[PDB]
Design a protein around this ligand. Structure first.
Ligand SMILES: Nc1ncnc2c1ncn2[C@@H]1O[C@H](COP(=O)(O)OP(=O)(O)O)[C@@H](O)[C@H]1O
Ligand SMILES: [Co+2]
Length: 298
């Protein structure tokens, strides 16, 4: 947790999100008012959880962490709501996974602020804002959509991480890791830790391009940052479905994984990076995919 930003000033990137959040945060603090409800949406590892904690820290209130699938019976939701103190942040990750039972209960605590519930700030996190119910989504006065980070931003996050792990790194090497981080801070930091391991075993004074390449080879990460499963998705569409189009459920069944893990975790960067495309009839692979994986373009 020593690598987790403790404030917006330590949060690299997401300029648009930061200015919007900072505005609402500073104003609330100055007026001593409870912050309006906030919804954080975007792929995993982009900092949603980090922002939820920063919000509570700046308001100088307590944060209550929970998950949608964890809150099944109304009893679990009631207990949490009644433990909230004025101004507290109720952070619900995977909020779109709330069942109608606890959902309707949470919905009520937002309007009438009674189940007697102390005014609080609801901070929800989801991979896609479109997953939340129409009713609940209209309750958030602040919606922050996080998109993938730029290579420059990731490079900065990597250099910051290395410094915190007591390891030197050359700019060129940091650039190389960032280019292979699939636009995600979580991925970039994990790769940096693994490259640190290589530097340790090879007894180097600082992380260079050579050390990075050696590590990428051990981790099976290619020049585009794609890992084994990313390649598996693309290769399955290419070989089994002749390039597509193939439906999400069909592709998921062939891969032996939940459709959610596919469309919420892996597909986002593949679409953003131009390896995959979505059509009404299903997912399709692009020419860039065939060329990158060295497949004869049909
Ligand atoms: N802007 C950022 N600067 C530095 N590290 C970041 C940033 N955003 C995310 N991270 C890092 O990445 C990891 C992932 O973040 P997290 O907030 O848990 O993601 P999410 O809830 O979106 O899955 C955290 O370790 C965190 O400290
Ligand atoms: Co479908």
């Amino acid at each position: 947790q020593f690598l987790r930003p403790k404030s917006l000033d330590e949060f690299i990137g997401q300029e648009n999100v930061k200015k919007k959040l900072s505005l609402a945060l500073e104003a609330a603090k100055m007026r001593g008012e409870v912050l309006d409800h906030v919804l954080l949406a975007g792929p995993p590892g982009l900092g949603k959880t980090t922002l939820a904690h920063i919000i509570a820290s700046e308001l100088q209130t307590n944060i209550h962490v929970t998950s949608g699938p964890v809150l099944v019976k109304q009893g679990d939701m009631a207990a949490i709501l009644t433990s909230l103190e004025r101004g507290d942040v109720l952070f619900i990750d995977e909020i779109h996974r709330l069942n109608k039972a606890v959902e309707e209960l949470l919905y009520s605590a937002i309007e009438d602020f009674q189940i007697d519930i102390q005014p609080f700030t609801l901070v929800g996190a989801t991979t896609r804002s479109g997953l939340l119910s129409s009713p609940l989504r209209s309750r958030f006065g602040i919606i922050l959509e996080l998109d993938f980070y730029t290579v420059k931003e990731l490079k900065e996050i990597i250099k910051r991480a290395a410094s915190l792990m007591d390891v030197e790194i050359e700019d060129a090497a940091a650039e190389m890791i960032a280019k292979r981080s699939r636009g995600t801070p979580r991925i970039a930091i994990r790769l940096t830790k693994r490259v640190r391991d290589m530097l340790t075993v090879v007894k180097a004074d600082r992380i260079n391009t050579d050390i990075v390449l050696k590590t990428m080879e051990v981790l099976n990460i290619d020049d585009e940052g794609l890992d084994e499963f990313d390649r598996k998705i693309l290769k399955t569409i290419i070989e089994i479905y002749r390039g597509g189009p193939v439906g999400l459920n069909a592709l998921a069944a062939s891969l032996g994984v939940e459709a959610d893990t596919l469309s919420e975790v892996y597909e986002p960067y593949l679409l953003q990076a131009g390896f995959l495309a979505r059509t009404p009839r299903g997912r399709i692979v692009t020419e860039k995919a065939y060329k990158h994986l060295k497949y004869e373009v049909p």
